């Protein structure tokens, strides 16, 4: 069926309301909350009963073909993807999810540069891993600079999902480089650019400074 | 209390067949109004309900699907089984199964979830190797360290730190395939900086789809040099 919105950053307190049309009449609606690669929690069913331990400040609500989930006064952990399920009448049929954020105030990354391990090295290979930490808004710009040249290409970022405690992001940018290349060259810097930086902070190392 | 748990192969090979058990307790599904269910999820993508058995073995598909669909269950042995024919790339998902209690509610309790890729590139546990704290003097407040787990396929691998002593401060980053077809991911932990050198930090890495299992030592390195 239909849900609505699919995406949606709010700020603590915030009521959020989440809506299911379905194009066919529904006798009742069911929904859940699912953390990230968690499993779903059911919070509502028959459309408005609150399951079991679930905070009274999620109601359901609705009928015909237009249901609703709200959220009277949203928190930090109330981050998660929200779902309609219509088990009343076939076919049963979930909703698309609405994924909702918490905004927070702006919170700067603390940065952090590892080198290849000699270990690794042995393997052929050399990844350098650079890690911001604990930040907010998740837009970060991550660039790698091999002897001040500007990389392309040749690493992969990865962003954590929103923290149920802190509201912030981390994220990796690893680089990938042969032995080989990765001994063509002495300085190995990651660049970073946030809102909550005044100006750009940069980690790095030499080749064999250890 | 009620449990449910789902198990199978992590990867399957496209137009094989998968067969998926949910194992539950805490409840039995010859009690009246009990039902077990089964959903997935595709990475990134929405919950698709997929079938349903009732207590007095009454099947359910979804449609879309039942084709390939057939569910069972065996009371004796308190487990459903779902077997899905002719596997797809697009059938990649995790998959849960569910208790629901007909004429009162969908879906109460849900099983962990077990994780099936359908590809036909093989099995590979990982290599995994220490991020050296860049620290290692005392009166520096905090470090970070962590290990790179790559080069291993399918998902999913998990990671802990101190055989789950240490969890304040993880961030164990969501895998990313590479180029070379194979997944690699780093989890990270801040400490106190005067525990370099003294406190002993060791990542224990499972990839259950291979049964492999790694700790590694992280540690500030000895620097090469003239001492």
């Known amino acids: 069926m239909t849900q609505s919105p699919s995406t949606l950053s709010a700020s603590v307190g915030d009521r959020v309301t989440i809506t299911c049309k379905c194009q066919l009449s529904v006798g009742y609606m069911h929904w859940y909350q699912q953390k990230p690669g968690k499993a779903p929690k059911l919070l509502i069913y028959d459309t408005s009963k609150l399951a079991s331990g679930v905070p009274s400040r999620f109601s359901g609500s609705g009928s015909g073909t237009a249901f609703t989930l709200t959220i009277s006064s949203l928190q930090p952990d109330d981050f998660a993807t929200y779902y309609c399920f219509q088990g009343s009448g076939y076919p049963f049929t979930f909703g698309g999810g609405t994924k909702l954020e918490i905004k927070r105030t702006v919170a700067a990354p603390s940065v952090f540069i590892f080198p290849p391990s000699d270990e690794q090295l042995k393997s052929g290979t050399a990844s350098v891993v650079c890690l911001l930490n604990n930040f907010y808004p998740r837009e970060a710009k991550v660039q790698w600079k091999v002897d001040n040249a500007l990389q392309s290409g040749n690493s992969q970022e990865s962003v954590t999902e929103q923290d149920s405690k802190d509201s912030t992001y981390s994220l990796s940018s690893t680089l990938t480089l042969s032995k080989a290349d990765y001994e063509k060259h002495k300085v190995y810097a990651c660049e970073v650019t946030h809102q909550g930086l005044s100006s750009p902070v940069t980690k790095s190392f030499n080749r064999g400074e250890c | 209390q009620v449990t449910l748990r789902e198990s199978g192969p992590a990867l399957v090979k496209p137009t094989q067949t998968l067969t998926l058990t949910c194992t539950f307790s805490?409840?039995?599904?010859?009690?009246?109004?009990?039902?077990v269910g089964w959903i997935r999820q595709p990475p990134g993508k929405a919950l698709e309900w997929l079938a349903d058995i009732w207590w007095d073995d009454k099947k359910d598909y979804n449609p879309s699907l039942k084709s390939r669909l057939t569910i069972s269950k065996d009371t004796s042995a308190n487990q459903v089984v779902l077997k899905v024919t002719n596997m797809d790339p697009a059938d990649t998902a995790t998959y849960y199964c569910?208790?629901?209690?007909?004429?009162?509610?969908?879906?109460?309790?849900w099983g962990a979830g077990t994780t099936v890729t359908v590809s036909s590139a093989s099995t590979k546990g990982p290599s995994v190797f220490p991020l050296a704290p860049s620290s290692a003097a005392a009166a520096g407040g905090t470090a970070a360290l962590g290990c790179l787990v790559k080069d291993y396929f399918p998902e999913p691998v998990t990671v802990s730190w101190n055989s789950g002593a240490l969890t304040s401060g993880v961030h164990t980053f969501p895998a990313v395939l590479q180029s070379s077809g194979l997944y690699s991911l780093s989890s990270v932990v801040t400490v106190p900086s005067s525990s370099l050198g003294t406190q002993t930090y060791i990542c224990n890495v499972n990839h259950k789809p291979s049964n492999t299992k790694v700790d590694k030592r992280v540690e500030p390195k000895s620097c090469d040099k003239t001492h």
């Open positions: 569910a208790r629901s209690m007909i004429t009162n509610w969908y879906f109460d309790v």
């Open positions: 805490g409840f039995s599904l010859s009690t009246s109004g009990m039902s």
